[PDB]
Design a protein around this nucleic acid. Structure first.
Ligand code: MG
Ligand code: MG
Ligand code: MG
Ligand code: MG
Ligand code: MG
Ligand code: MG
Ligand code: MG
Ligand code: MG
Ligand code: MG
Ligand code: MG
Ligand code: MG
Lengths: 94, 136, 82, 56
RNA sequence: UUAUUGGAGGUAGAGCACUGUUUGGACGAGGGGCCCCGGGUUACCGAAUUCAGACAAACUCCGAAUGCCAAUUAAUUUAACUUGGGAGUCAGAACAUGGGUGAUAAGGUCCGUGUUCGAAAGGGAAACAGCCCAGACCACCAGCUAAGGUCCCAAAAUAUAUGUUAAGUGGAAAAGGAUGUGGCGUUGCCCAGACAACUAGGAUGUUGGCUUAGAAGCAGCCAUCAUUUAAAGAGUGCGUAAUAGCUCACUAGUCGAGUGACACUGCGCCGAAAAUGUACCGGGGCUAAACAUAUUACCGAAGCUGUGGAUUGUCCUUUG
RNA sequence: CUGGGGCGGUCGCCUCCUAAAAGGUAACGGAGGCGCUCAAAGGUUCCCUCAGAAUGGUUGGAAAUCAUUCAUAGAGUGUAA
RNA sequence: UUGGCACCUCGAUGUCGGCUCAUCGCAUCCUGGGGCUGUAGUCGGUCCCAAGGGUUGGGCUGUUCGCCCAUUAAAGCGGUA
RNA sequence: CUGGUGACUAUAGCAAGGAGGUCACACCUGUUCCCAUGCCGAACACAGAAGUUAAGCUCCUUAGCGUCGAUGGUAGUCGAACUUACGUUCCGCUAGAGUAGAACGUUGCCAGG
């Protein structure tokens, strides 16, 4: 239930396009106990984890040094490309 | 033949065809569906031909949902006329389809049966298509 | 050469050049038309009169300010320069 | 201070862009101007960035 | 002109709150076919309601980018306005792009916007008003560049590096069709023996039941099970009027390494028939002299620069 | 005027869409109105709030008038938008 | 082919049919070579290759067409103002 | 604290539950008078105070609805390069919807407690 992520800076349209081509997925982390953080996660790894935990399963996100348990609040998908364009992670109060 | 019972305006501007599908890009009523990968007008006749083909192969055991409806009327001038002197009479009814739009949805059959049924439907339609399933 | 029918349309009225006549933050002399409109899309504000045709006009010399007037309404006002 | 050179011609270009090139003080093709750096100048350069080369 | 700030407005997109359009679910206000003033329940459920999903130039709960109007506004630039003398013009064209019309026809037609032509020579696009580069004061057997190019025609790389293509693709076209070939993933089986081949079996109830004149595994329907297994379907096909017969699925051996499916992609293939002569690279020719991605050179104009000269402004300023 | 002319249609004015979120903008483009009306349907002062639906009630019926509740405007605004 | 458009030609680009002379394309009428066939043979059907040569005389109609008579291996379809 | 009267885009509303009454505000009691009903003292008006917090009203709780609402991403788009592709690429701007969240108001002046 753990997948590593990398933080992101301000991005141009080209950068995000390169990220998705690389196979990484742009994402944001929000919720209780966390400020909004923009993160990138590998698509394949995310898909494996979500299968293990399910759609609403709690996930351990390696947000920089800290690790935050998160849920997939929402995701954006491209039907033609069969690719997840964006993922929203909601922090869960424990 | 699917067509609107009434319209406020019988003579309408032809729809914009450039761009990607606004909605109906996900299978919501059935297990499987046919996704358009190209843009074209879809006529009421084309819908019926595709519908009849898919139902026959399915043998009516499965349920067919037709996602697209031909709302827009289109006109044609009478034959051998010069330009001008007003717009022509209504000739047909069409649905604008852009890449991503799910044309039809099928349920109550095995995938193999659905794939063949949608294949038979695809050959009746102007656009290029891809077989699609509900995504979770 | 096939014979042809005719359209029953082909008519339109003259355009009435409605809309803003003066900018927000611009000085205007008294009597200056600020906005031309049918009904009250913009309401008469401070030192601004509404004509019989719903034209908005400055009632004094001053600066034009377009202002909100509740959730879904707007008004135009004129304020005298110091 | 920035040095702006008109590397590409204003022929075939929209008039509004031509006005900006005039405003920057650029004249004939390959002409140069030396101007102080400020936001207003940068905006003019931004409008005609395709037509000019900038050196600091 | 730009920056900064304020404002008007409803387009693109989006959305369905309104007006219409529309798909699939449920669900019923109220009685009829139906079962009692004495009750019920297998249409219509049309009212309505609800959940999910779509559509709109003349729909909008929303709503940009731009453009527009301004500012005792700053930077840069050089116009602007008024009055008076003299005009010409009122057939426009292409291209790009936002639209109407036409057929998401026209080198069509009609409006918005920009550019060029018109009224513009020079270089490129073989030739080619309107495309691309660029605006010719005059002279030079000087230099640097643009678009476009660098094997020969024909000036400059037979340049460098790493791949792709085999179709002269490059150097005209579609639905659709295909063990062409390259790349990046996903997944099944496999030296406790994969895939293919070869050898052997491939059975019994049973010719399963109905149908049909006939249906025995193989015209059409219902079910699709037990038994001996080292394995067998109430049969994937060929075949018989029905049979039969052949064969397959599946299984056990021989050799031993890979073998199968799926998704996303690069570049190619077929689909592809017209009239004087090759004739859809400008030619020769090219397997790179094609294509992709980088790197460094060079060529290339009447552009820019150098030198001399002309005319007219401006500024220094008798001078020049 | 006219996608040659004739024939057909049209000619002024108003409203909308085309119109590309200022304004303006064409085609024999898509839709409709006008050549009035009102002596109050004008002015002012004061007062007032709809359509529709449900339920109850006689003549009375889906629908007349009455009553309560809900109803934010789906009403009305002389006459197109 | 019937049209759409109105771009060269109105200080002239002669217009239907026939006659004379042809010439080219191939989507092939005949003849030559094939595949498949619901191909026994003789005949056919359909498709592929193939443009070398060949592809008749009459009645009616200005006719092009078209019908008809009699043939022929066949009586091809188009372009060339 | 309460009341009168103002400001603000409902974060301010709606709904539901609860609480409160020397004064105040109502309900309320009458119609003699001012005044009133297209009938009606219902309302309006006036004269009052027996009764009552029942309701309105005020206060408290709440997030069901309505309202507000990011960040991130997406659509669209100015400009540019490339192309003619129902296009591509780069840059700036940047929604709508949805999500986290906000929110059962915040305040000015005057008179009382
Ligand atoms: Mg108008
Ligand atoms: Mg739209
Ligand atoms: Mg134009
Ligand atoms: Mg050479
Ligand atoms: Mg050089
Ligand atoms: Mg020069
Ligand atoms: Mg406008
Ligand atoms: Mg505009
Ligand atoms: Mg013309
Ligand atoms: Mg002559
Ligand atoms: Mg041939």
């Amino acid at each position: 239930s753990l997948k590593s992520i990398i933080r992101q800076g301000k991005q141009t349209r080209s950068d995000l396009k390169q990220l998705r081509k690389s196979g990484k997925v742009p994402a944001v982390v929000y919720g209780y106990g966390t400020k909004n953080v923009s993160v990138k996660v590998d698509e394949v790894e995310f898909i494996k984890v979500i299968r293990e935990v399910g759609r609403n399963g709690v996930i351990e996100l390696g947000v920089g040094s800290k690790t935050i348990k998160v849920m997939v609040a929402d995701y954006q998908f491209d039907p033609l490309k069969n690719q997840i364009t964006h993922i929203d992670f909601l922090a869960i109060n424990m | 033949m699917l067509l609107p019972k009434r319209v406020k305006y019988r003579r309408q501007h032809r729809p914009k065809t450039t761009g990607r599908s606004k909605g109906g890009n996900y299978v919501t009523f059935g297990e499987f569906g046919l996704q358009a990968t190209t843009t074209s007008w879809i006529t009421s006749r084309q819908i019926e031909s595709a519908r009849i083909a898919m139902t026959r192969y399915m043998k009516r055991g499965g349920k067919v949902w037709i996602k697209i409806f031909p709302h827009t009327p289109y006109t044609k001038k009478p034959l051998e006329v010069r330009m001008g002197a007003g717009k022509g009479a209504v000739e047909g009814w069409i649905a604008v389809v852009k890449p991503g739009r799910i044309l039809f949805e099928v349920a109550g059959v095995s995938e193999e049966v659905a794939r063949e049924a949608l294949r038979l439907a695809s050959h009746k339609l102007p656009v290029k298509t891809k077989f699609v399933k509900r995504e979770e | 050469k096939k014979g042809v029918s005719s359209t029953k349309n082909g008519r339109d009225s003259e355009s009435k050049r409605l809309g803003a006549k003066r900018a927000d933050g611009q000085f205007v002399t008294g009597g200056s038309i600020l906005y031309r409109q049918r009904g009250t899309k913009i309401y008469p504000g401070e030192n601004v009169g509404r004509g019989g045709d719903d034209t908005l006009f400055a009632k004094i010399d001053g600066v034009v300010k377009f202002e909100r007037k509740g959730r879904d309404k707007k008004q135009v006002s004129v304020y005298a320069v110091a | 201070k920035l040095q702006i050179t008109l590397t590409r011609s204003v022929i075939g270009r929209p008039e509004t862009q031509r006005k900006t090139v005039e405003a920057l003080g650029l004249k004939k093709t390959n002409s140069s101007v030396v101007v102080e750096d400020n936001p207003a100048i940068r905006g003019q350069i931004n409008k005609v960035k395709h037509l000019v080369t900038v050196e600091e």
